Amino acid sequence: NGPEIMSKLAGESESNLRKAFEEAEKNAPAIIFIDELDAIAPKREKTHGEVERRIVSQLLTLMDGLKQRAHVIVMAATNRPNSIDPALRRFGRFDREVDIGIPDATGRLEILQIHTKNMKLADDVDLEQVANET
Amino acid sequence: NRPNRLIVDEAINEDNSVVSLSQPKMDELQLFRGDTVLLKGKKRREAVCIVLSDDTCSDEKIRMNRVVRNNLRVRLGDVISIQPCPDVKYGKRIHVLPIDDTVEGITGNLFEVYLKPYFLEAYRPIRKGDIFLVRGGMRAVEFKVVETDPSPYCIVAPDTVIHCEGEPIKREDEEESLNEVGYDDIGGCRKQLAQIKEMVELPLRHPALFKAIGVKPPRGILLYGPPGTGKTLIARAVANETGAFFFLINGPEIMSKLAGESESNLRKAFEEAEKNAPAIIFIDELDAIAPKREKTHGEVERRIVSQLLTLMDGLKQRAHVIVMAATNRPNSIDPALRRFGRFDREVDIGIPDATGRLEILQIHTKNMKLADDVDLEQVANETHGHVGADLAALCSEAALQAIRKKMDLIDLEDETIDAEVMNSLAVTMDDFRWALSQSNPSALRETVVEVPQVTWEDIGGLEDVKRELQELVQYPVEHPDKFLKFGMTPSKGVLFYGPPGCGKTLLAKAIANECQANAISIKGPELLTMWFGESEANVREIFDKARQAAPCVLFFDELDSIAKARGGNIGDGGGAADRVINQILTEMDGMSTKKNVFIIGATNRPDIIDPAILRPGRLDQLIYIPLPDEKSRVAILKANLRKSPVAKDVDLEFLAKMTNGFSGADLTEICQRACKLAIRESIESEIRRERERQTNPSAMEVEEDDPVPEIRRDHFEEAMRFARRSVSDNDIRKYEMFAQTL
Ligand SMILES: Nc1ncnc2c1ncn2[C@@H]1O[C@H](COP(=O)(O)OP(=O)(O)O)[C@@H](O)[C@H]1O
Ligand SMILES: Nc1ncnc2c1ncn2[C@@H]1O[C@H](COP(=O)(O)OP(=O)(O)O)[C@@H](O)[C@H]1O
């Protein structure tokens, strides 16, 4: 979690990051997930603290090292591709990008079905209209 | 003086145990190509190889590759001996063994598949100690001759036995790893690699010579280019091809620490490089360490920049260490480094061409299997905007596209996948097309400098302008001295004025193709983008690129676009000046003649162009491009139709005579319309044919005939209905008036 790293000091933060990477490597084949990546590594124009720039380089070194060792895979979640640094979007760190976009009427209907399983419904539901109106 | 020894050089023939020398030195050695010859080298080792001769190679150069050099303990520029080997013997069982960690993760009867086809029909002259190599099934493995039943060297008989056993062993520290790179592992950077090699071959192969003369070598080099182009790869290849010690530094690894650790690591790096002289230092992501002071706020950043400057200054006094740095653009970093003594020498890598992309594909397709359908020429043509890594990824992706569902399901239960089934799979072009269309994150949109392919034959007629053009460009370079004898100074600019669609853009590239020089083209939308964005500084960059790509040609079209934007031809109240042409004139006037950078402009409304750009100097010469005539229209039609299949009932001269006041594009559009009609007719006919007989359950009904492989006068005469004039006669009268009032 991004904030959990930003809510500490340099030593603790850059020890937890490394320790997480070692733990992921030890339990291979494993997966690492990161969210709120913007909170950690935005473009340098928005960064002023020296510690903030000292926390991005560590991540780049770890990503470069990953290629040599183990089967670990890394996945990150962001709001928009341009919100983060362009140095991560290179060959060997975050080459692959994917979009989730937004569900359609069929997707909304499916989500309603998922969320209405254990619930009891009457005969007047007609979820199609709700999906159209949603 | 004893022409026994000889110099080393690259090898063209990739087959091992093979060489290539010049034609004349046959009696100089008294032997033929088929003759087998032993070749000497240090640590008291000599290897046998077959012979062959070429012509392009000088009489003083041997041709040989990485593996033979490895089993001879040699590098380029060195020298060895030679002696023919008519005393060869046909060797029976000669025990071998696969000696590497390449073994790791292998299975199957590699013996047969890998070796029997290699030694097949080979008669490979083999001598003990050889470390010969072979590639197959996405991998590349090597074997060493441990014993030769007859010794030391022997022919291999297609009948000789190979009872192949033994387990992997270790490579002594003497020889290096197969993975180590070389000049043969890169393509598309032939010009740059030549510059670097010629620049840094003396200080490392001949340092005592530098100590013997008073001259200042370079002790700092900068390379700029987009990411994924092969800069660190080039550095490591150069280091491996000379034996000089190599050391690496990573920008983030320094910024991921505190001041003391960072500024201790840098000093220790420099000290180790000095102690291991002759050595090379490489730095990447230099912008991450030393950007311009405007972007730095932390004091420690300035401290590390100052430390780097001081260490660069201190390098000059001590040792033979060389420093190389990699960046994206020259202006991204501080200007204090670009001085005399720190980073004086600079280099561009740019982008590979179709040939370079083809070479990269060949490099990355060695171990991978392939099929007949696959051709690397068409793929290179459809891979614009791809640099290095991209292609590699593509390759891998394509391979997986074949493996994933078919092989996984088959092997899931049948048996633990072995080498035989693993390498049995080939690759198909449909897989390449899938990997190309689906995964096409082209990573580049910047300008491209390269030699075009258009030729005079592509253009129709216009011979006199060809003669007038060769004089302005060819004669200077072919015969510079002639001008010195007289008092002439060649002009550097020309301007084309005329109606649209008359091949003005084609000449600028035909000239470059004839002269084999780089070409750059900037379109009007870019000029308007700079005008609205009020960014005239970019102009300078363009010229710098041309300055570094000389000899080259510069092209500007839609030069009247700005004048048309602000008001009509007369314009608004303002005059005929603007913010961009002023910068262009400022750059042109302050340019040297010896750089050989020609300038071409093009337009169709010279009336409103600023006169200041046509004064003696600058763009003094003007040429008029008229509408194609009958004899030119036939040539244009033939040139446009030399690519598509056509019938013979056509009468091209009849159509050309029928056309008057037409443009070159006015005929290409007719060709495309007729081709579209043919495609539509074929589609409808084929779909109807497939649909009709499906109801009729005839298991076999194949009257297979190309419904319309070629087009007739019907489609063309249909197309002439929509084919009409484009340029008004009044416009031609205006052009002639402007061409006569001069
Ligand atoms: N000219 C080239 N020929 C072959 N491979 C290349 C070339 N340029 C880049 N590559 C590929 O790029 C990868 C290395 O990228 P690198 O050169 O480190 O990126 P950068 O240019 O940003 O330093 C290698 O795996 C290599 O296969
Ligand atoms: N002399 C010519 N011979 C063959 N094709 C021509 C000729 N002139 C124009 N064309 C056609 O016109 C197109 C290029 O148009 P161009 O003449 O560059 O326009 P502009 O004059 O605005 O630069 C090409 O596709 C080409 O087929």
Short mmCIF file of N, CA, C and O and ligand atoms in Angstrom, two decimals, chain A residues 90, chain B residues 185-187 189 226-233 360 363-364 388-389 392, ligand 1:
data_model
loop_
_atom_site.label_atom_id
_atom_site.label_comp_id
_atom_site.label_asym_id
_atom_site.label_seq_id
_atom_site.Cartn_x
_atom_site.Cartn_y
_atom_site.Cartn_z
N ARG A 90 9.61 1.53 -19.39
CA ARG A 90 10.76 1.14 -20.20
C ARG A 90 10.75 -0.35 -20.47
O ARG A 90 9.80 -1.05 -20.10
N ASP B 185 26.79 -9.02 -33.13
CA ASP B 185 25.53 -9.07 -32.41
C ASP B 185 24.72 -7.78 -32.54
O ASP B 185 23.70 -7.63 -31.86
N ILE B 186 25.15 -6.84 -33.39
CA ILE B 186 24.46 -5.57 -33.56
C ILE B 186 24.32 -5.29 -35.05
O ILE B 186 25.16 -5.68 -35.86
N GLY B 187 23.24 -4.61 -35.40
CA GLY B 187 22.99 -4.24 -36.79
C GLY B 187 22.28 -2.91 -36.87
O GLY B 187 21.55 -2.52 -35.95
N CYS B 189 23.79 0.00 -36.94
CA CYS B 189 24.65 1.04 -36.39
C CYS B 189 26.05 0.93 -36.99
O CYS B 189 27.06 1.10 -36.30
N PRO B 226 17.22 7.64 -28.42
CA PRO B 226 16.07 7.15 -27.66
C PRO B 226 16.38 5.84 -26.96
O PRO B 226 17.34 5.15 -27.33
N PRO B 227 15.61 5.47 -25.94
CA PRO B 227 15.90 4.24 -25.22
C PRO B 227 15.65 3.01 -26.08
O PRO B 227 14.92 3.05 -27.08
N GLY B 228 16.26 1.90 -25.67
CA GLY B 228 16.15 0.67 -26.43
C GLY B 228 16.81 0.74 -27.79
O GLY B 228 16.23 0.29 -28.78
N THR B 229 18.02 1.30 -27.85
CA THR B 229 18.76 1.42 -29.09
C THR B 229 20.08 0.67 -29.11
O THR B 229 20.62 0.44 -30.19
N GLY B 230 20.61 0.28 -27.95
CA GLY B 230 21.81 -0.53 -27.91
C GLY B 230 23.07 0.24 -27.58
O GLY B 230 24.11 0.04 -28.21
N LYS B 231 23.00 1.13 -26.59
CA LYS B 231 24.16 1.91 -26.19
C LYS B 231 25.05 1.14 -25.21
O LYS B 231 26.25 0.98 -25.45
N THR B 232 24.47 0.66 -24.11
CA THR B 232 25.24 -0.19 -23.20
C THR B 232 25.70 -1.46 -23.91
O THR B 232 26.80 -1.96 -23.64
N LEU B 233 24.88 -1.98 -24.82
CA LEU B 233 25.30 -3.13 -25.62
C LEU B 233 26.53 -2.80 -26.45
O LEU B 233 27.47 -3.60 -26.51
N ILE B 360 18.44 -6.90 -37.39
CA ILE B 360 18.05 -7.21 -36.01
C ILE B 360 17.18 -8.46 -35.98
O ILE B 360 17.33 -9.32 -35.10
N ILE B 363 19.36 -11.39 -36.32
CA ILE B 363 20.08 -11.63 -35.07
C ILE B 363 19.20 -12.37 -34.08
O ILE B 363 19.64 -13.32 -33.41
N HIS B 364 17.94 -11.96 -33.97
CA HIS B 364 17.03 -12.52 -32.97
C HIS B 364 16.32 -13.78 -33.45
O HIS B 364 15.55 -14.36 -32.67
N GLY B 388 15.12 -1.59 -31.88
CA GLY B 388 15.78 -2.55 -31.03
C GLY B 388 14.84 -3.45 -30.24
O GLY B 388 14.17 -4.31 -30.80
N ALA B 389 14.82 -3.24 -28.92
CA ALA B 389 14.07 -4.10 -28.01
C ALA B 389 12.71 -4.50 -28.57
O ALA B 389 12.34 -5.68 -28.53
N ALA B 392 12.75 -7.50 -30.77
CA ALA B 392 13.00 -8.69 -29.97
C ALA B 392 11.72 -9.15 -29.29
O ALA B 392 11.30 -10.30 -29.46
N1 LIG C 1 20.92 -2.35 -32.73
C1 LIG C 1 20.49 -3.38 -31.97
N2 LIG C 1 20.70 -4.66 -32.33
C2 LIG C 1 20.28 -5.70 -31.58
N3 LIG C 1 19.62 -5.54 -30.42
C3 LIG C 1 19.33 -4.31 -29.94
C4 LIG C 1 19.77 -3.14 -30.70
N4 LIG C 1 19.37 -2.06 -30.01
C5 LIG C 1 18.73 -2.49 -28.89
N5 LIG C 1 18.72 -3.84 -28.85
C6 LIG C 1 18.10 -4.64 -27.76
O1 LIG C 1 17.89 -3.80 -26.62
C7 LIG C 1 18.27 -4.46 -25.42
C8 LIG C 1 19.16 -3.56 -24.56
O2 LIG C 1 18.62 -2.25 -24.49
P1 LIG C 1 19.58 -1.02 -24.07
O3 LIG C 1 20.51 -0.76 -25.23
O4 LIG C 1 20.15 -1.31 -22.71
O5 LIG C 1 18.58 0.23 -23.94
P2 LIG C 1 19.16 1.73 -23.93
O6 LIG C 1 19.48 2.01 -25.37
O7 LIG C 1 18.04 2.56 -23.36
O8 LIG C 1 20.38 1.63 -23.04
C9 LIG C 1 19.00 -5.74 -25.81
O9 LIG C 1 18.32 -6.89 -25.29
C10 LIG C 1 19.01 -5.77 -27.32
O10 LIG C 1 18.52 -7.02 -27.80
#
